Every structure is written in C-alpha cells, then in structure tokens.
Design a protein around this motif. Structure first.
Motif, mmCIF file in Angstrom:
data_model
loop_
_atom_site.group_PDB
_atom_site.id
_atom_site.type_symbol
_atom_site.label_atom_id
_atom_site.label_comp_id
_atom_site.label_asym_id
_atom_site.label_seq_id
_atom_site.Cartn_x
_atom_site.Cartn_y
_atom_site.Cartn_z
ATOM 1 N N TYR A 84 0.823 -1.210 0.000
ATOM 2 C CA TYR A 84 0.000 0.000 0.000
ATOM 3 C C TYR A 84 0.860 1.265 0.000
ATOM 4 C CZ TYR A 84 -3.804 3.170 1.315
ATOM 5 O OH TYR A 84 -4.726 4.189 1.349
ATOM 6 N N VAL A 96 1.376 4.230 -2.883
ATOM 7 C CA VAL A 96 1.131 5.654 -2.647
ATOM 8 C C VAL A 96 2.338 6.486 -3.075
ATOM 9 C CG1 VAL A 96 0.914 7.369 -0.826
ATOM 10 C CG2 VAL A 96 -0.627 5.402 -0.871
ATOM 11 N N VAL A 152 2.778 6.537 -6.855
ATOM 12 C CA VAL A 152 1.822 7.421 -7.514
ATOM 13 C C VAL A 152 2.264 8.872 -7.387
ATOM 14 C CG1 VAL A 152 -0.500 8.365 -7.311
ATOM 15 C CG2 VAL A 152 -0.171 5.896 -7.450
ATOM 16 N N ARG A 153 2.702 9.275 -6.190
ATOM 17 C CA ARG A 153 3.167 10.651 -6.008
ATOM 18 C C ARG A 153 4.334 10.971 -6.939
ATOM 19 N NH1 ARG A 153 7.600 11.479 -3.028
ATOM 20 N NH2 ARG A 153 7.012 9.462 -2.118
ATOM 21 N N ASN A 193 -3.814 13.851 -13.235
ATOM 22 C CA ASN A 193 -3.583 14.399 -11.902
ATOM 23 C C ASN A 193 -2.774 15.688 -11.968
ATOM 24 O OD1 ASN A 193 -5.038 12.487 -10.500
ATOM 25 N ND2 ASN A 193 -3.262 11.197 -10.028
ATOM 26 N N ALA A 203 -3.966 19.353 -10.807
ATOM 27 C CA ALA A 203 -3.189 20.174 -9.885
ATOM 28 C C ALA A 203 -2.957 21.569 -10.452
ATOM 29 C CB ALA A 203 -1.857 19.493 -9.571
ATOM 30 N N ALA A 237 -4.375 24.995 -8.887
ATOM 31 C CA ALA A 237 -3.439 26.055 -8.532
ATOM 32 C C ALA A 237 -3.884 27.391 -9.109
ATOM 33 C CB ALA A 237 -2.034 25.695 -9.016
ATOM 34 N N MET A 278 -10.927 6.472 1.534
ATOM 35 C CA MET A 278 -9.558 6.571 1.044
ATOM 36 C C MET A 278 -9.288 5.517 -0.026
ATOM 37 S SD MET A 278 -7.331 7.441 4.469
ATOM 38 C CE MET A 278 -7.320 9.089 5.169
ATOM 39 N N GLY A 279 -8.015 5.273 -0.308
ATOM 40 C CA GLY A 279 -7.652 4.297 -1.314
ATOM 41 C C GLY A 279 -6.150 4.220 -1.464
ATOM 42 N N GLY A 280 -5.731 3.359 -2.388
ATOM 43 C CA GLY A 280 -4.318 3.172 -2.651
ATOM 44 C C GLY A 280 -3.749 4.220 -3.582
ATOM 45 N N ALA A 281 -4.413 4.441 -4.714
ATOM 46 C CA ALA A 281 -3.992 5.448 -5.675
ATOM 47 C C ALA A 281 -4.696 6.784 -5.488
ATOM 48 C CB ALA A 281 -4.228 4.946 -7.105
ATOM 49 N N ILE A 298 -5.249 8.575 -2.255
ATOM 50 C CA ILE A 298 -4.535 9.429 -1.313
ATOM 51 C C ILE A 298 -3.162 9.798 -1.859
ATOM 52 C CG2 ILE A 298 -5.833 8.414 0.582
ATOM 53 C CD1 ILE A 298 -3.139 7.021 1.394
ATOM 54 N N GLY A 299 -2.505 8.869 -2.556
ATOM 55 C CA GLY A 299 -1.248 9.204 -3.202
ATOM 56 C C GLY A 299 -1.414 10.294 -4.241
ATOM 57 N N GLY A 300 -2.481 10.207 -5.038
ATOM 58 C CA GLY A 300 -2.749 11.248 -6.013
ATOM 59 C C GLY A 300 -2.994 12.601 -5.373
ATOM 60 N N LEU A 327 -2.008 13.656 -2.391
ATOM 61 C CA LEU A 327 -0.814 14.189 -1.748
ATOM 62 C C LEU A 327 0.274 14.559 -2.749
ATOM 63 C CD1 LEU A 327 1.786 11.913 -1.337
ATOM 64 C CD2 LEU A 327 -0.003 10.832 0.009
ATOM 65 N N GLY A 328 0.260 13.981 -3.949
ATOM 66 C CA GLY A 328 1.123 14.466 -5.008
ATOM 67 C C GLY A 328 0.625 15.788 -5.555
ATOM 68 N N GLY A 329 -0.700 15.905 -5.668
ATOM 69 C CA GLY A 329 -1.292 17.163 -6.079
ATOM 70 C C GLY A 329 -1.032 18.283 -5.095
ATOM 71 N N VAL A 330 -0.959 17.959 -3.802
ATOM 72 C CA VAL A 330 -0.616 18.967 -2.801
ATOM 73 C C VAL A 330 0.774 19.531 -3.072
ATOM 74 C CG1 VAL A 330 -0.082 19.316 -0.373
ATOM 75 C CG2 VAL A 330 -2.170 18.123 -1.021
ATOM 76 N N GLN A 331 1.745 18.651 -3.324
ATOM 77 C CA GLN A 331 3.095 19.114 -3.635
ATOM 78 C C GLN A 331 3.117 19.930 -4.920
ATOM 79 O OE1 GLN A 331 5.887 15.753 -3.501
ATOM 80 N NE2 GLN A 331 5.065 15.277 -1.469
ATOM 81 N N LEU A 332 2.397 19.471 -5.947
ATOM 82 C CA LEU A 332 2.378 20.197 -7.213
ATOM 83 C C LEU A 332 1.775 21.588 -7.044
ATOM 84 C CD1 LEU A 332 1.504 17.517 -9.916
ATOM 85 C CD2 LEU A 332 3.716 18.284 -9.035
ATOM 86 N N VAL A 333 0.636 21.683 -6.355
ATOM 87 C CA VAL A 333 -0.021 22.974 -6.186
ATOM 88 C C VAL A 333 0.823 23.893 -5.315
ATOM 89 C CG1 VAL A 333 -1.437 22.339 -4.183
ATOM 90 C CG2 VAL A 333 -2.234 24.081 -5.763
ATOM 91 N N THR A 339 -12.605 2.549 5.135
ATOM 92 C CA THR A 339 -12.748 2.349 3.702
ATOM 93 C C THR A 339 -12.214 0.966 3.339
ATOM 94 O OG1 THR A 339 -12.568 4.732 3.290
ATOM 95 C CG2 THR A 339 -12.196 3.302 1.428
ATOM 96 N N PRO A 387 -10.195 -0.542 1.099
ATOM 97 C CA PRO A 387 -8.769 -0.912 1.008
ATOM 98 C C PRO A 387 -8.125 -1.190 2.354
ATOM 99 C CG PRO A 387 -9.225 0.990 -0.386
ATOM 100 C CD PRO A 387 -10.541 0.550 0.171
ATOM 101 N N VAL A 432 4.151 14.649 4.007
ATOM 102 C CA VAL A 432 3.434 15.696 3.291
ATOM 103 C C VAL A 432 2.488 16.383 4.265
ATOM 104 C CG1 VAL A 432 2.065 16.259 1.260
ATOM 105 C CG2 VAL A 432 3.556 14.247 1.244
#
Lengths: 40, 55, 130, 370, 40, 55, 192, 40
Positions: free
Chosen positions: D26, D30, D33-34, E15, E19, E23, F1-4, F6-8, F10-16, H2, H4, H36
C-alpha cells in the motif's frame, strides 16, 4: 436497552443500562469498568 | 453499545485524546507567545505616553 | 516478487550508473539465470504494453521501472556485468515508452499552435478580403 | 509449554509478516503514484515547451525554459537521486532530438548533457557513501548541483529569501539598540528580546520547515563582519551546541535511570546484585556467612552514597542545560518546536514593527518650537 | 482531468493537469508552454 | 480513502504548492509595495496639514 | 513509514520514526507488558527486514534489539514480583524503560511539563507575596488563598488524571535550594 | 473506514483510520507516514 445486554442476562440488566444512560450516558460505568474517560 | 463498538470507540477516544493533547501543547505555546507580545507592546505604549506627557 | 527496499552501495551505484546521459551509449548457472530474468523482463514489458498498463495505471512509468528493478535486484546470483546489461535493457524500454509519450505530447502542442496561428491568419485575411 | 507458546508466537509473527507485506504494498503504491505524478507534470511541461517551436523559430527561449525545468526537477527534494537523474536524462534527450538540426542549440544541449554527465559521476559517488551523515551528504549534493549550475535558478530564490531574513535580523538588532537609546525599553527587557531573536532564528534554522540550509550557510559564514555583534556568534554557537547537548541530556537521563535502578536493586537484594549485573551498570560503577554479608552491607552504604552523589551531579548538569536552553526558548519538545517556528518569527517581527512605529511617532513629535 | 490528456498518456498526467487547474486554472502552464497570458 | 487516491491527492498537494509558491511572494511584494505607498501618502498629507495650519 | 523508502533512500528518518513509535508503544500505560513487548518486537523485526542490505541501519537496529532484549530480561523479573506494591512496580518499570533509552521522548516531554509547572508554582508564590505587601490583599484573605493554592497543588499531584510522577519527584527530591522553601516543604509534607 | 484498509487487515485498522480522521483528518498520519503536510 440493547439486545446484547439482554443476551448477557435478563431485562433487569437492560433497565440498569438505561439508568446508566439516563444518568450520564454510561460515562461513570465506562470509566469504572474500563478506566477510559469518555468525556474528559 | 454492543461488544465491538464499545472497544472501537474506547480506542478511538484514546487516540483522539493523545493527538488533541499534543495540539493543546502547541496551542498553549501559541497563546503564551501572543500574551508576551501583547504585554511588551502595552509596556512600550505606556512608556510612550509618559514621554509625551513629560514633553 | 518482493517490494522495493534499500539496496547495497554497489547495487545502487550500478542501478544509477545505467542511466546513460548523453548520446554516446547505444549454459552455466549465471548465464541461465540471466537469460531467465531477461525473458521475464521482456514478458513484463510486453504485458505492460499490450495490456494498456502505461496509461490505465496511475503510476505507469514509475511502476514499470520499479517492477523491473525488483525483478533484476531480487537475484543475488548474477554477475555485475549481466545486471548492468539487464538494467540497460529495462531503461531502453522505459526510454522507448517516454519517446512515444513525447511524440503524443508534441502532436498535441503542434495542433494547439497551428489552431491559434490559423485563427489569427484567417481573421486578418477575412478583414482584408471584406 | 515453552515449545507450544513458541510455536504460537512464531505463527503470530508470520501472520504479522504478511500484514506488513500488505501495508508495504500500500505505502509503495502511494509513494509511486506521487513520484509518477510529479515526473509526468515536469515532463509534460518540458515537452509542450520544446514542441511549440515552428519550422524556423529561435530555440533560445525554449532551451532556457528546458534548462529552468531541469533545474526545478533536479533541485526537487522530495524525489530520489535516481528519479531526478532519469527525468533530466529524458528531458535533455527530448530537447536534443527536437532541436537536432540547429548547430548552436545542439552544441548548447550537448554542453548541458556533459555537465549532467559530470554531475552524475560525482553525485553517485557522494550519495552512496554510508560513512557520511545524511545531512552532510545532502549539503554536499546541493553543493555539487550548484557547482555544475543545474540548480542555480532554483537556489537563487531561496538565497535571496535568506539574505532578506539576515538583513531583517540585523535591522531588528540595531532597532532594539536604538530603542534602548530612546528610552522606550529598559535594559532588562532587551535581554529577553535579544534572547527571543536568537531563539527564533535558531528555531527556524534547525526545526523549521523547508530547505532552510541557505540561512544556515548565511549565518555560518563568520568571515563576514556585518553586525557580528548583533548576535551572529550566539546563533552559530547555538546551532553548534543544541543537538549535541540534547543528545547529552538524553544520555544523562539514561545514565540517571540506570543509577536509580542499580540503587534500588542494591537496596532490595544486597551485594548479590553485583554478582550478575549487566555490562553497562558495571561500567557505570567502575566510572558467605552473614558477618561477611554485614561487612558487605557496610560497604553497600558507602556505595549507595556514591551513587546518590553521582545522581546529584548528573541531575545538576541536566538542570543547567535545560535552564540555559529555556533561557532562549528551545526547551520545548521537537514536535512542539517544529510546529511553532514560523508563527514565533512572525510574532517577533510584528512586535518589533509596533515598537518601531511607536518610536517613529515619538521621534516625529520631537520638534523645536523656535 | 479530461479525456485528451488521458489519451496523451497515463492518469498521472490527468492528476498533474488537475493540480495545475486547482493552482491557477493552468494559467502558469499555458503561459510557460505557449507564451500567452490568459489572465493579464 | 484508497491506494492510488490518497497518493494522487498528496502528489497534487506538492504540485499545487510548487506552482503557487511563485505567486505567493509576488502577491506579498505587491502588498508590501502598497503598504509603503500608503504610508508615504499618509506621512506626506500629515506634513501638508501641518504646513496649512501654520500658514 | 519503513516501506516508504526508495531503492537508494537513507533510512535515518525512518529509523528515528520507528524509535518514536516504539517509545510511544512501550510507554503506553493502557497495554500490558506482553502486548507492548510483542508489538515492539514485531516493529523491530519489520524494520530490520526492510533495511537488511544497509550495514549501518542493520547495526543500529541490531543494537536497539539488544537493548530491548535486556529491557525484557529485566522487566520479566520486575513485573511479576508479587511482594512489591503496584506504584513501586510501575515506578521501577518506568526507570527500566528510561534506562535502556526506550521512552526518551515521552519522558522528556513529561519532565519539561513538570519543569514549567514548577516554574509556574514559584512565580505564583512570589506573586502572592508581592500581593500581600502591595495592599491589594489583606492578611486573612492572603493566608486563606495560600492554603487554597497549596491544597490545589497537592490535589493535582496526588489525584490528578495523568503522569504526575515527575512533579512528585521534583518536589520530594531536590538538588540545590529548590523545594527548600516553606511552601515547597509544606507541599512535601502534605504529599507524605 | 474504507474497503482498502479492510483488505490490508482487520476491522480495527478501520477503527484506527477513523480515529485519525476524527482527530485531525489524518493530517498527522499523512505527515508522519509520507512527509506531506496536508494543511500547512
């Protein structure tokens, strides 16, 4: 006042749990039996 | 009530209590710094008023 | 196949060295195992390409690279040169996928620029003509 | 009983191994993906920039934008070295392929790729050394990136921010001195305010958020003499001493706990505790019939007195360390200090802004009646 | 977050575009790749 | 939540954060410039009022 | 946390976070000794398994397992002793945990909170003394308020719902001209 | 809370996740596990 408490024993236990809930929502009962303060 | 819900909510309230305790320490220092800054500003203002009266 | 984890200094150095910067680079037990892992890498790439995994999966390129590295590095009975060759093959497949994605993005950008320039030119020509 | 309990515990450990494997999958998904999202964003920007050139467009702006994007990618601190190097490789290869026909731009791209070649050679060696600390290795990696010019564009913004913060700190110190000179603030209050300045600066440098290495290098540069009396030496001393003394305090607490345990066991069991004491307690101490066992108790009295005295000395040293740490305001736990840095600096700045406003009002009202 | 971007490559590109939109509505992206300021 | 999921996010948080971190200091500079301009105007108008009263 | 490391990542931060989590688990008063030991063992085993290829991380994790093993060896004898009271057993268990460097963060936080509480105690006592001679409070209200303040401090130390043992150690045991004032001596006597 | 997390293991894991969400929306969880800051 719930089916598990009837399963433990009697309808009198249901009355006791209802009294606990009407008193403090079983706050004292939970604290005394388990040691966790629901409403700190 | 039930058998599992009671344990679940007890665990949850324990964890929430710990996290909120940490956040409470953080917020307590927040308010302490706020009060210190306000006291400093008030003392300086009193000094300025005294200087103006003397002038 | 185990999950990704921390490597030894030598293995990590070998993995990072295989990234060829610049346009200046392109049965015994060990040989049998290298051939087997090469076949496995080829099958993995074929499954990813044919199954449309590079687009449908959120971590396409990174997951493909990490899976390839997991298959390569899980074999401790392989000589360093064979590992370098396998990682070079995997990175070549990754670069081919990146090149295809680059071609698609280039087509998109060309279409946008052509549309904008055509709109401006047609406005001016229509005004003059009228 | 022992073998059955061992079997049950091993079974439990195997199942927890399976659970850890699932959680590992898991978390790996994550993180993957990031990283993929970040890499795809950077690559898409680079690609759409390089593809916008026409049949006869000048690629100087496109090459500059690609260089800036590679600067952003390489200097990104949330990505591993392998991903950053590979993304830079892809971007530079795409730029070379698209602008292959222009001689000057091709030469510039080739020079950039040779710089990346040398940077890769040095960074692979620097990164994979296990005899070097993580912080110093990261500092050396940023130093190498600045050396090859990859991250100059990205680092300039943080460098300017750090310079502005340093200038603001010097101005605040001079303003506090002038505040004493005007008479609005007493001498006792200035000690607290200067300690607040130093504590806030040290907190930002150490426990702050983001790449605050620029300010650390700014303050570490003792060669510069600009307002050295403002407190730069104090900041450098605190930066050098705080982690070391926190480690020393933790070690002293562990030693005090060991001494207390040894004293309690000596009281409860007697001299027999010294027979099978573990190595650490034996090292700390180094640094029959009841009659002989009564002489042993008589010696035990003196041993307990010595242990108590050592406990007193260690506690006094810990108290001194904690007291002069709290003098500046860095005695809070690590999480509390980390969450309370930017707001503390903002409060300090706002307080000094109000003080300067009042001082300016007082000085402006100072006018002659003739 | 649009089908053309999925066709270009991956869901991760979707994605990234989301983003950008969150932004500034892809203002910086359009300025950087194309050179046209949507919000002057 | 989920696997892809929450990762998406939190990646968007960094990008923004990366995208908006350039605009943040530009807006801060705009605010500082406006504040200093307003201070200049206020001080100048106070001095002007003093001159008018004297005259 | 452990599984988030990349192929070439450095596990220093991951190992520190594992240390923090094991400190939180071992210090937890709501779990028995068996559960805490077993959970800490599982955490250390996972951490060791995921960093086996790094020599420094492997050595660090091995040394920490040795420390935990020594702690288990001592706590087995300590916890199951039936001739000691519950309070003494818990105090000795906390001393054992602090001895091996397990509950570092929690102990430091508790000590810092107790230090702040003691400083506040001294400042409030000094404020009372200033108030008495400033004319704001007369003698009778002053002594009544001092009694109430001391009683509140003693009640917090004794019947408080938290880890107040650090403040009790601060009050009962002292190094140099601390806890030697009349008020602190009265607090010690009341606690006894 | 959830599916998962159910797939990862147990129902008590859902209880822990729900506790974190109720506490701070898993802000500390996300920060400590991934690094993060969701709410900076």
């Amino acid at each position: 006042q719930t089916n598990p408490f009837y399963d433990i024993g009697g309808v009198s236990l249901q009355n006791a749990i209802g009294a606990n809930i009407q008193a403090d929502g079983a706050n004292e009962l939970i604290n005394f039996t388990t040691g966790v303060n629901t409403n700190a | 009530m039930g058998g599992a819900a009671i344990g679940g909510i007890l665990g949850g309230v324990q964890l929430v209590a710990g996290i909120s305790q940490a956040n409470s320490q953080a917020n307590a220092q927040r308010q302490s710094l706020q009060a210190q800054a306000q006291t400093t500003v008030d003392a300086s203002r009193i000094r300025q008023m005294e200087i103006l009266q003397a002038r | 196949s185990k999950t990704q984890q921390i490597l030894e200094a030598g293995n990590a150095a070998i993995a990072q060295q295989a990234v060829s910067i610049g346009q200046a680079s392109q049965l015994t037990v060990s040989e049998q195992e290298a051939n087997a892992v090469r076949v496995e890498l080829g099958d993995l790439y074929n499954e990813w390409r044919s199954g449309d995994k590079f687009r449908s999966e959120p971590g396409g390129m990174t997951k493909f690279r990490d899976a390839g590295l997991a298959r390569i590095m899980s074999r401790t009975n392989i000589t360093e040169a064979q590992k370098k060759e396998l990682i070079n093959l995997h990175y070549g497949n990754w670069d081919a996928e990146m090149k295809a994605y680059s071609d698609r993005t280039a087509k998109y950008a060309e279409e946008v620029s052509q549309v904008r320039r055509e709109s401006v030119i047609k406005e001016r020509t229509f005004r003059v003509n009228s | 009983k022992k073998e059955l309990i061992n079997l049950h515990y091993g079974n439990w450990d195997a199942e927890m191994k399976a659970y850890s494997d699932r959680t590992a999958k898991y978390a790996e998904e994550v993180s993957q993906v990031r990283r993929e999202s970040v890499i795809k964003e950077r690559t898409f920007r680079v690609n759409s920039v390089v593809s916008g050139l026409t049949w006869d467009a000048d690629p100087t702006d496109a090459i500059k934008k690609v260089d800036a994007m590679v600067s952003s990618t390489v200097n990104d601190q949330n990505l591993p070295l392998l991903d950053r190097l590979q993304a830079a490789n892809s971007m530079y290869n795409t730029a070379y392929e698209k602008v292959v026909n222009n001689a000057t731009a091709r030469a510039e791209v080739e020079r950039k790729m040779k710089a990346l070649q040398a940077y890769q050679y040095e960074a692979i060696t620097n990164w994979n050394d296990q005899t070097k600390p993580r912080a110093e290795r990261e500092a050396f990696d940023q130093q190498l990136q600045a050396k090859h010019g990859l991250n100059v564009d990205s680092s300039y913004m943080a460098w300017e921010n750090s310079r502005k913060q340093y200038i603001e700190f010097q101005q605040q110190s001079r303003q506090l001195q002038d505040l004493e000179q005007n008479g609005l603030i007493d001498s006792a209050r200035k000690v607290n305010l200067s300690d607040d300045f130093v504590g806030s600066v040290v907190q930002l440098i150490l426990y702050g958020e983001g790449n605050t290495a620029a300010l650390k290098e700014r303050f570490t540069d003792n060669r510069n003499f600009e307002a050295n009396t403002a407190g730069a030496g104090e900041v450098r001393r605190l930066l050098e001493a705080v982690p070391r003394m926190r480690r020393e305090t933790d070690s002293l607490r562990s030693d005090n706990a060991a001494l207390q345990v040894a004293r309690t066991r000596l009281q409860r069991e007697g001299v027999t505790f010294l027979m099978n004491a573990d190595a650490r307690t034996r090292g700390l101490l180094e640094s029959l019939t009841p009659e002989q066992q009564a002489e042993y108790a008589r010696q035990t009295n003196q041993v307990q007195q010595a242990i108590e005295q050592q406990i007193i000395i260690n506690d006094q040293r810990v108290q001194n360390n904690a007291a002069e740490l709290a003098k500046y305001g860095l005695s809070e736990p690590e999480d509390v200090l980390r969450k309370n840095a930017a707001t503390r600096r903002k409060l300090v700045n706002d307080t000094m802004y109000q003080l300067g406003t009042q001082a300016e009002q007082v000085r402006r009202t100072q006018t002659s009646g003739y």
